[PDB]
A and B are shown apart, each in its own frame.
With several copies, the nearest count.
Chain A
Amino acid sequence: MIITSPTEARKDFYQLLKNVNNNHEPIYISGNNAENNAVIIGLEDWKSIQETIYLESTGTMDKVREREKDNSGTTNIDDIDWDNL
């Protein structure tokens, strides 16, 4: 956990933006009032999180997890008979 104050984060802001993107680790901004505590995350890591939340919210990861552990077998994608549904 990387934790810093609002004051120090603002002074070190440009390096912080570099750091969150090269370490792939969020930085916690924790100040006087937990009201305005925040987290800074690299855009790429945020897009992964956004995409994960979307596939969980639709139930897609639910179905993925079920199919992953089932015994239905596999089929090479080129062997799919599309005209038979």
Chain B
Amino acid sequence: SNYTVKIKNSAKSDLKKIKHSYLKKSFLEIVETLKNDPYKITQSFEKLEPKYLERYSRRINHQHRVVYTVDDRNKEVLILSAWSHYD
């Protein structure tokens, strides 16, 4: 690891849907990349607009993303969504 990867507790309901969808293995692959280098140009890494806010996404599959931010100073990644839906 180089970064601590956290998830917002309110995003845990997302992980329940990931688990039921059998997306756990894809999701944890993204987690492993976030631990090593959250800016690696893999997994369809995207810098979301507006770019000055520095929110990012990676593809779990063609429907769902992990959306996250990064605290560079403290080397922490914050996962905010793992399910691409309004709830």
A52 interface neighbour in B10, B48, B81, B87, Cβ under 8 Å: B48
The interface residues of chain B, by DSSP majority, are classed as mixed
A63 interface neighbour in B7, B46, B87, Cβ under 8 Å: B87
Classify chain A's interface size. 20 to 34
Contact A57 B79 (CB under 8 A): no
Q: Is A67 an interface residue (CB 8 A)?
A: yes
Classify chain B's interface size. 35 or more
CB distance from B85 to the nearest CB of A (A): 6
Contact B7 A75 (CB under 8 A): yes
Q: Is B70 an interface residue (CB 8 A)?
A: no
Q: Is B6 an interface residue (CB 8 A)?
A: yes
- Rounded to whole angstroms, the CA-CA distance of A80 and B24 in the bound complex is 12
Q: Is A14 an interface residue (CB 8 A)?
A: no
In residues 45-84 of chain B, which contact A (Cβ within 8 Å)?
Answer: 46-51, 53, 55, 57, 65, 67, 69, 78-81, 83-84
* 24 CB-based A-B contacts, threshold 8 Å: A48-B46, A51-B65, A52-B48, A54-B84, A55-B57, A58-B86, A59-B85, A60-B85, A62-B86, A63-B81, A63-B85, A64-B80, A65-B86, A68-B8, A68-B69, A68-B80, A72-B8, A74-B8, A74-B78, A75-B7, A75-B9, A76-B6, A80-B15, A82-B15
